[PDB]
Amino acid sequence: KNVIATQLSEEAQVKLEVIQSLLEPCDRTTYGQKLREAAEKLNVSLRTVQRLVKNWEQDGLVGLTQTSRADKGKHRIGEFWENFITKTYKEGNKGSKRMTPKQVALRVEAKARELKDSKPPNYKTVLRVLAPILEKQQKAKSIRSPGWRGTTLSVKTREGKDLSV
Amino acid sequence: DYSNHVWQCDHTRVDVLLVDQHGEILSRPWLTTVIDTYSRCIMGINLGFDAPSSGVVALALRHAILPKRYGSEYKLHCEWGTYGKPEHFYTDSNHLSQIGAQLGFVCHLRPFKTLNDQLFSTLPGYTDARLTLRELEQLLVRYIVDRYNQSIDARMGDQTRFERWEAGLPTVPVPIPERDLDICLMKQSRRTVQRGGCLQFQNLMYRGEYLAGYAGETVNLRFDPRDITTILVYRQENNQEVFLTRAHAQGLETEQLALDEAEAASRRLRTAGKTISNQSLLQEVVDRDALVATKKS
Amino acid sequence: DYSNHVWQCDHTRVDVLLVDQHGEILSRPWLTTVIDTYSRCIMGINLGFDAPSSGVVALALRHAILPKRYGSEYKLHCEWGTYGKPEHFYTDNHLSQIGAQLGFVCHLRERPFKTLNDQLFSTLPGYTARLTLRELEQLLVRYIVDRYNQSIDARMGDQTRFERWEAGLPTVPVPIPERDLDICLMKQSRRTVQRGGCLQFQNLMYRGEYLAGYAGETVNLRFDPRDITTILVYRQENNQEVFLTRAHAQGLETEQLALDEAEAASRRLRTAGKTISNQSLLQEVVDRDALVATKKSRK
DNA sequence: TGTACAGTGACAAATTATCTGTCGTC
DNA sequence: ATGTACAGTGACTAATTATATGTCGT
């Protein structure tokens, strides 16, 4: 479905400024020089303008505006440690236990030593691993209820019978 | 050279004052219209109390390029049918440039007196205001299409301007998908999703198809100021706004509702609350303190 | 042309390896200076491990503009009298603003090094591990003036390098107070004023005449890394920044500490704390959890 | 001059995604 | 489909009014 560009940075506006100039209908006898007069203001070689117009047609304004790397938000400690961190925090916060990340990292240190792993994760990674989990556990406090609207009303009896009022 | 090459966009302010559903005096609306160059055909219009900023023109683009669906209340004779992606567009902020770019047509921005000459300039409250904005929407699409567009042109009077435009399209006018033309809509932002995927908008309440997955999150809305009965919701990201779902107005008493009507509903609801006297509710405040002024520990 | 007319900045990277005030190897410094292109004398000079950059260039420019002085351990026989703005400063955007503030032209895009590099530094036991950046001060700031600038070139009027300087003025500079150009100093974006006007910086604590009224507010510091024993506290306005107070380090043994020494001092605390034989200490955590997991619920 | 630990900002070191060349027939 | 609803918020907008401008001035 539709992807809308917003918050275009100024170099993306520069990309727009060439695209809005290349939008003048052209042919091979005109594309080459009307591209080159843009390449000089892009200050980069013609083939990049070709990939720019390629991506512009391929995706629109969100094609000329760069997309974050496939690695963003994904850790390099790997699948074992990503689990073990999150496993350990999760078990430490059921019942009234309230194991915070530092105590998890102290478990991670113990685990690597007994695993004979010479490179345990640093506490900053462990805190970054749990940061989205902590935020998901936070959001649950805020979720608003729409409430009843207008004149029509009923009340929810524990008999399961909604008594109209 | 051909018709449908360059599309003109024009503005005026209609010297007819209007009255609201509950009797409030409305303003005088601005009229914006999209017309051919080489035909005199009218292909897009928007009318309202919004100033002729980028707003009313961005909608008047959307008006033309989509299939011209129409309602029975218009009592239309003719199908307008003027779909087609433009290729050049011409007007009196920059946002028009982003639309032109994304839709792939050059925007190179810098005749309404036909309706000043016509009896349109003599309806009540022209120049008792016994008309309203929905009545103009129904009548004006008719009185333009069935009469001011379908008639013989002032010069080159061998063709009606619609038919001069219709035959002159270099091939056939091609409609394009609706949902890709959301950029032309209005925008509202940082709305918050309530339990079950619910949203408030213009004192009305809304609900989405899959929006319940993002309760407690925040989302943006886009809409037409012509029927807010369903409005498009998108999830905000760092440099992308992705369409999520439609959301449907709930509890409204009609099948259609213009934005002006939500303003009027609120304004009547608000103006009722303003008439209530606080005289009791106020005097008790000073009397509570005058009592407590006697307290000493 | 004149001794205040045209000053040129220069830089060098030193060929000596340094040890801290305890005995561990640090690096080989960067070195930078400005030279009056009229008199050809080495004046304002900075030395340290921070690499040449607009902050370092601006810091050496303060070292040129401000009247030079020495501590009671030097009291050196030769001294710079250099001070004042040039009409033009050469180092061939931040350097534009200092010129626009002080009112001198900024240009950016014969040099003396061998008189120290080959003649002196190559002779030291630590030439390219047994002398310190407190010592490599005088081993430059003495010899650069007590020998190099005190030398005479007949190529330029047969006078000592600085005699041409103090002779060659169309109007002799007045000295500039230290308060007039803190813009050359370092910057700290946020610091919080603790109770009683105390402020932590570089693991030290500072207090100053009026700072306690700002307790629980945020202030900016500017400081000179050659001795952090004073720091300057600044309060930010809507679009201005006003000099708030000086501040003085509490509890120092000797009132001379440089930024480099404070880092190496704090690196002692860090290395000491990191020395714990913690592996015998982990046994508590795993056996505490094993005990709690051995307790199954009653139902 | 309370005490001082868990969390956090600004940064450097390391990893590695991907985008920029000189190019080849199209 | 719908807990409740008030105090505090944001995103503008009408009115104020501090003060930047363009010309003359000496």
Side-chain angles (χ1 to χ4, degrees), chain C residues 22 30 45 81 101 109 137 188 246 266 270 281:
Chain C
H22 313 90
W30 302 92
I45 193 145
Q101 184 64 13
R109 282 94 186 270
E137 188 78 347
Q188 294 295 348
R246 194 254 200 86
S266 295
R270 185 63 184 127
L281 191 149

Short mmCIF file of all heavy atoms in Angstrom, two decimals, chain C residues 22 30 45 81 101 109 137 188 246 266 270 281:
data_model
loop_
_atom_site.label_atom_id
_atom_site.label_comp_id
_atom_site.label_asym_id
_atom_site.label_seq_id
_atom_site.Cartn_x
_atom_site.Cartn_y
_atom_site.Cartn_z
N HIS C 22 53.02 8.30 36.62
CA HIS C 22 53.24 7.07 37.36
C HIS C 22 54.22 6.13 36.68
O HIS C 22 54.97 5.44 37.37
CB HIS C 22 51.91 6.33 37.62
CG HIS C 22 50.82 7.21 38.14
ND1 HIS C 22 49.94 7.87 37.31
CD2 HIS C 22 50.47 7.54 39.40
CE1 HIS C 22 49.09 8.57 38.05
NE2 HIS C 22 49.39 8.39 39.32
N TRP C 30 50.92 15.55 19.63
CA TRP C 30 50.84 16.58 18.60
C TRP C 30 51.37 17.89 19.17
O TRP C 30 51.35 18.13 20.38
CB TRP C 30 49.40 16.77 18.13
CG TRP C 30 48.76 15.53 17.58
CD1 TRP C 30 48.01 14.63 18.28
CD2 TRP C 30 48.77 15.08 16.23
NE1 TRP C 30 47.57 13.64 17.44
CE2 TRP C 30 48.02 13.89 16.18
CE3 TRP C 30 49.35 15.56 15.05
CZ2 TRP C 30 47.84 13.18 15.00
CZ3 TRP C 30 49.16 14.85 13.88
CH2 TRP C 30 48.41 13.67 13.86
N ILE C 45 52.00 28.73 21.61
CA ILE C 45 52.34 27.33 21.35
C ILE C 45 51.51 26.44 22.26
O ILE C 45 51.23 26.79 23.41
CB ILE C 45 53.85 27.06 21.52
CG1 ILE C 45 54.20 25.69 20.93
CG2 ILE C 45 54.25 27.10 22.98
CD1 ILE C 45 55.56 25.65 20.30
N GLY C 81 56.85 38.55 25.30
CA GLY C 81 56.04 39.73 25.47
C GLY C 81 54.89 39.80 24.48
O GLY C 81 54.22 40.83 24.41
N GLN C 101 34.55 38.18 16.14
CA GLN C 101 34.42 38.72 17.49
C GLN C 101 35.54 39.70 17.81
O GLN C 101 35.29 40.82 18.25
CB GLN C 101 34.40 37.58 18.51
CG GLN C 101 34.17 38.02 19.95
CD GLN C 101 32.82 38.66 20.18
OE1 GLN C 101 31.92 38.59 19.34
NE2 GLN C 101 32.66 39.28 21.34
N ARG C 109 42.84 27.46 4.62
CA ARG C 109 42.52 26.54 3.54
C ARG C 109 42.44 25.12 4.07
O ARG C 109 41.47 24.41 3.84
CB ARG C 109 43.53 26.64 2.40
CG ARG C 109 43.34 27.85 1.49
CD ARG C 109 44.18 29.04 1.90
NE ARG C 109 43.86 30.21 1.09
CZ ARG C 109 44.47 30.51 -0.06
NH1 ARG C 109 45.43 29.75 -0.55
NH2 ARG C 109 44.08 31.60 -0.72
N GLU C 137 56.82 20.18 28.93
CA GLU C 137 56.58 21.62 28.88
C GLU C 137 57.84 22.47 28.83
O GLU C 137 58.14 23.06 27.79
CB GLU C 137 55.72 22.06 30.07
CG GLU C 137 55.26 23.50 29.97
CD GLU C 137 54.09 23.69 29.03
OE1 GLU C 137 53.77 22.76 28.26
OE2 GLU C 137 53.48 24.78 29.06
N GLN C 188 31.94 22.50 27.81
CA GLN C 188 31.10 21.39 28.26
C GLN C 188 29.63 21.77 28.16
O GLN C 188 29.19 22.76 28.75
CB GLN C 188 31.45 20.97 29.69
CG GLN C 188 32.84 20.38 29.83
CD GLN C 188 33.00 19.07 29.09
OE1 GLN C 188 32.03 18.47 28.64
NE2 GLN C 188 34.23 18.61 28.98
N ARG C 246 33.91 32.00 38.05
CA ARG C 246 35.03 31.08 38.12
C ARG C 246 34.72 29.98 39.14
O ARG C 246 33.79 30.09 39.93
CB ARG C 246 36.30 31.86 38.47
CG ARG C 246 37.61 31.12 38.27
CD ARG C 246 38.22 30.70 39.58
NE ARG C 246 39.64 30.42 39.44
CZ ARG C 246 40.59 31.34 39.52
NH1 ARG C 246 40.32 32.60 39.81
NH2 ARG C 246 41.86 30.98 39.32
N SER C 266 42.48 9.66 37.25
CA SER C 266 41.23 8.90 37.22
C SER C 266 41.39 7.51 36.63
O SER C 266 40.70 6.58 37.04
CB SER C 266 40.18 9.69 36.44
OG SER C 266 39.87 10.89 37.12
N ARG C 270 40.17 3.74 38.01
CA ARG C 270 39.56 2.75 37.13
C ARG C 270 40.33 1.44 37.09
O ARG C 270 39.74 0.36 37.19
CB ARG C 270 39.42 3.35 35.73
CG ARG C 270 38.69 2.48 34.74
CD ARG C 270 37.25 2.27 35.17
NE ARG C 270 36.57 1.36 34.26
CZ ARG C 270 35.91 0.27 34.64
NH1 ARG C 270 35.62 0.05 35.92
NH2 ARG C 270 35.48 -0.58 33.72
N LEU C 281 33.78 -14.28 43.60
CA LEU C 281 32.62 -13.54 44.08
C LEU C 281 31.33 -13.93 43.36
O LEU C 281 30.24 -13.76 43.90
CB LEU C 281 32.89 -12.04 43.93
CG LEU C 281 31.99 -10.97 44.56
CD1 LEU C 281 32.80 -9.74 44.91
CD2 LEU C 281 30.94 -10.60 43.54
#
